[PDB]
Amino acid sequence: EKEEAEEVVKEALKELKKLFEEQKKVNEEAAKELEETAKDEKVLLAARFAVEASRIANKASFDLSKFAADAAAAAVEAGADIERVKEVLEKAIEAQKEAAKFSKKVLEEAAAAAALAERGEITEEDVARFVVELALELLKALFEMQRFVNELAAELLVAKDEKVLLAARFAVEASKIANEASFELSRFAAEAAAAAVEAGADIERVAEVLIKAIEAQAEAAKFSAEVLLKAAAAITEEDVARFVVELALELLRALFEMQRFVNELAAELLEVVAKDEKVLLAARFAVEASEIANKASFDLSKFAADAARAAVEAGADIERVAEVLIEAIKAQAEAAKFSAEVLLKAAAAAALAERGEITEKDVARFVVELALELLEALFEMQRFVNELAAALLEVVAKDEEVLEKARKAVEDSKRENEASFEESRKAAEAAAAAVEAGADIDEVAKELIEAIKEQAEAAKESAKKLLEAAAEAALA
């Protein structure tokens, strides 16, 4: 029974291993042939990209297939109908074959556009667009495999306990929301490389940044698999809630690390594009301001999970705590996408300035109004997480004297967050009025960075005093 079920899993992983290394040898020999038809270096630079990126798609294909097998093995160890395990293993084998057929389809596009360009007609920008468009193709393909395999691993996770099943539902929900945000962050890194190619940047810098973004997806893909395999590797009702909080913190931490790595990939792509000094200062200002907003949002998401930690140690049930953590993770995903859209629009305006279509005052005006958009989105998240902390307090604060001190602390943070945005808004419309009067972007950006950091400082101190009140309410 279960021993035979463990025999089907090991043979499934055995087949997945040979499928992965048969496709490895097929693609590795298609790379030598791709080296032959690489007349001129630009074709070889694109051929080596398609080869290196296809080896990532094939390697990430097996890592996601092995995760499905390890998830199926864990199901057998803790009760499993063997026919639903065979069904999941069969679907994972088809996904490996499908991802293998795509890794070769990538090299088909490479060899086609290769000799086509050396024959003529195809310019280097079309080769540069081919590399960028291919980057989009693999990033989307890796996300679909991870979404499909995580769906299979969801069906596997066995609990036989409502509370533990609610925790498995949270792990599946939180990982799916984070994997969607990581895909959109890597997509913005590829959309930034598309604006750099159409602006005149060299494909060599664009190619290596895209490889950084492709590998970032695979590393986050395996991390999400390892945490979900920890979730399967499960008692105490409070240790289940402690797992949910620690899982929510790890995904928020990996999401910010993706926001940080992708933010730095945009700075590299702006350095090659922004050849003008004053436009480079606007690019470097928007890059830093966007990253500051990423830290502040992550600090506001970590405060929510820390407030949820103080709630589970006070005795709040897992169900309400899982809701607040779900709302916090998607709140960080909203900021991650919003901060990426702001930085994407900044790269476009810098490209317009490089082409000469807009002036430097237009770029200075644009990065200032983008700074206010980030200051508003940070303030809207401060009010959102403040509502979540007030919700968690309404469950743990039962003594009317404890509730009164807690509700007062929620109000004080509401006034502190509001007043901090007024300070950041006054400085925003002051820096905008300076741009129109002809003030140098160096001084405007310097004073706006200090305003954004001062709101981030006020947000930290407000969250510190608020988490303090929730902790004392838990002690009583």
Author numbering: 1 to 157, 160 to 236, 245 to 486
From the paper:
We construct twistless helix repeat (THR) protein blocks from identical straight α-helices (typically 2–4 helices in each unit); the length of the blocks can be varied simply by varying the number of repeat units. Using X-ray crystallography and electron microscopy, we validate nanomaterial designs ranging from simple polygonal and circular oligomers that can be concentrically nested, up to large polyhedral nanocages and unbounded straight ‘train track’ assemblies with reconfigurable sizes and geometries that can be readily blueprinted.
To generate straight, linear THRs, we set Δθ to zero. This results in perfectly straight repeat proteins in which each repeat unit is translated but not rotated relative to the previous unit. We tested 33 linear THRs (with Δh = 0) with helices either about 20 or about 40 residues in height; 23 of 33 tested designs were solubly expressed, and 13 of 19 designs analysed by SEC were primarily monomeric as designed. Structural characterization of the linear building blocks by X-ray crystallography individually and/or cryogenic EM (cryo-EM) in the context of assemblies (see below) revealed that both the detailed internal structures and the overall straight linear geometry were successfully achieved.
